[PDB]
Copies of this chain bind each other. A is one copy, B any other.
Amino acid sequence: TEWYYTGSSFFKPEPITQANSRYVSSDVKFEKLENNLPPPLLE
């Protein structure tokens, strides 16, 4: 599956990037992606 960022007050799916994403501590309820890793997570 593929994941896209969207705005809060209007609906527009957009690519996930560093600007709209923040690094946070690990958690169980966070989704775990085997592939299609977003640029921030991908290394």
A19 touches which of B17, B18, B19, B23 (Cβ 8 Å): B23
For chain A, the count of residues having a C-beta within 8 Å of the partner chain is: 7
Q: Could you tell me which residues of chain A, from 11 to 33, have a CB within 8 Å of some CB in chain B?
A: 17-20, 23-25
- Docked Cα-Cα span, A40 to B18, in Å, equals 13
Shortest distance from the beta carbon of A18 to any chain B beta carbon, whole Å: 6
- Docked Cα-Cα span, A20 to B23, in Å, equals 9
- Docked Cα-Cα span, A43 to B24, in Å, equals 21
Chain A contacts to B: CB under 8 angstroms: 17-20, 23-25
Selected A-B contacts with CB under 8 Å, 6 pairs = A17-B25, A18-B23, A19-B23, A19-B24, A19-B25, A20-B25
